[PDB]
Design a protein around this ligand. Structure first.
Ligand SMILES: COc1cccc(-c2nc(Nc3cc(C)[nH]n3)cc3ccccc23)c1
Length: 263
C-alpha cells in the first residue's frame, strides 16, 4: 500500500479527462491491466477542489462492490496526483446512449437492477447521494455497469461553469429547494436514470435554470407514447415529490417490471 509511478507500465490514453487524462497501465509484477487517472496539482489547486478530492478518496477506498469502480489506491508526485483505478474496457453509458439514442426495456431494467445493488450497499455503508448520471457510468467487459462518480475519473474537460450544473437534472426537489435530505435522494436519481435510459433524455430538461427549477420542484414530466405501463409505474413511484413515498431499494428490485425484464 505504498505505490509509485514505477510500479506501472504506461499505455495509451483512454481519453481526455478533467484535471488530467486516464491511461492504460499494467502492474509490472502481476501483469494486470488497470486504468490510471492523472490529476494535476496546479489545476486542483486553483479550481478549489484539493480537499474535496481528499474527502472522496478516503471514502472510495473502503468500497468494494461488483458495480462500483474499485479504487485500488493512489499516490502523488511533484505535479500530479495519480489514482489507480479499475479498468472498464467498454465505454461510458453516455457514449452508448449517444450512438443508440435509447436502451430497450431489458437493458434498462438490467442497468437499474445493478444500480439498485450498488446503491443498497452504498446505503448500508452510510454512503448516499451518488452521482449516477450516464457519464459517470462505465461498462465492464460483460456489459455490466460500474459507478465511476469520484476523482473526476471519466469527466471530460469542462468550463467550470459547465460543471456547476453537471448534475442539476438529476437533483431531487429537496436538494434544489435547499431543504435537508436523506438516502431517499438516490431513489429519485434512479427514477431519472430509468426515464433517461428509456427515452434518451432525462425527464426535466429545460433551457433556463429557472425553468428547470420549476419543473423539478413541482415534478412536471410526461412520458412518450412508447413507454410501457410497468415502466411508468416504476418511474412514477420513484419520482414522487415527498421523499418518504419513494420505494425502498428492495421493492425496486422486487417490482414486477424489473423481474419481467432483467437477468
Ligand atoms: C470523457 O470520457 C472518458 C474519459 C476518460 C476515459 C474514458 C474511457 N474510459 C474507459 N475505461 C475506463 C476508464 C477508467 C478510469 N477505468 N476504465 C474506456 C473508454 C473507452 C473508449 C473511450 C473512452 C473510455 C472516457
Amino acid at each position: 500500500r505504498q505505490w509509485a509511478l514505477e510500479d506501472f507500465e504506461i499505455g495509451r490514453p483512454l481519453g481526455k479527462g478533467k484535471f488530467g487524462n486516464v491511461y492504460l497501465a499494467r502492474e509490472k509484477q502481476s501483469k494486470f491491466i488497470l486504468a490510471l487517472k492523472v490529476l494535476f496539482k496546479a489545476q486542483l489547486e486553483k479550481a478549489g477542489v484539493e480537499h474535496q478530492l481528499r474527502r472522496e478518496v478516503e471514502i472510495q477506498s473502503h468500497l468494494r462492490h461488483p458495480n462500483i469502480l474499485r479504487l485500488y489506491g493512489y499516490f502523488h508526485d511533484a505535479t500530479r496526483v495519480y489514482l489507480i483505478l479499475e479498468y472498464a474496457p467498454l465505454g461510458t453509458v453516455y457514449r452508448e446512449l449517444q450512438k443508440l439514442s435509447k436502451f430497450d426495456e431489458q437493458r434498462t431494467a438490467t442497468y437499474i437492477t445493478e444500480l439498485a445493488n450498488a446503491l443498497s450497499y452504498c446505503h448500508s455503508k452510510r454512503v448516499i447521494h451518488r452521482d449516477i448520471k450516464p457519464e459517470n457510468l462505465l461498462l465492464g467487459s460483460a456489459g455490466e455497469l460500474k459507478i465511476a462518480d469520484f476523482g473526476w475519473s471519466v469527466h471530460a474537460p469542462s468550463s467550470r461553469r459547465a460543471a456547476l450544473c453537471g448534475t442539476l437534472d438529476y437533483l431531487p426537489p429537496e436538494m434544489i429547494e435547499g431543504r435537508m435530505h436523506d438516502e431517499k435522494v438516490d431513489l429519485w436519481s434512479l427514477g431519472v436514470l430509468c426515464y433517461e435510459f428509456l427515452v434518451g433524455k432525462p425527464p426535466f430538461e429545460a433551457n433556463t435554470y429557472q425553468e428547470t427549477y420549476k419543473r423539478i420542484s413541482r415534478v412536471e414530466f410526461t412520458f412518450p407514447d412508447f413507454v410501457t405501463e410497468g415502466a411508468r409505474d416504476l418511474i412514477s413511484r420513484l419520482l414522487k415529490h415527498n421523499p418518504s413515498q419513494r420505494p425502498m431499494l428492495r421493492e425496486v428490485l422486487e417490482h414486477p417490471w424489473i423481474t419481467a425484464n432483467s437477468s
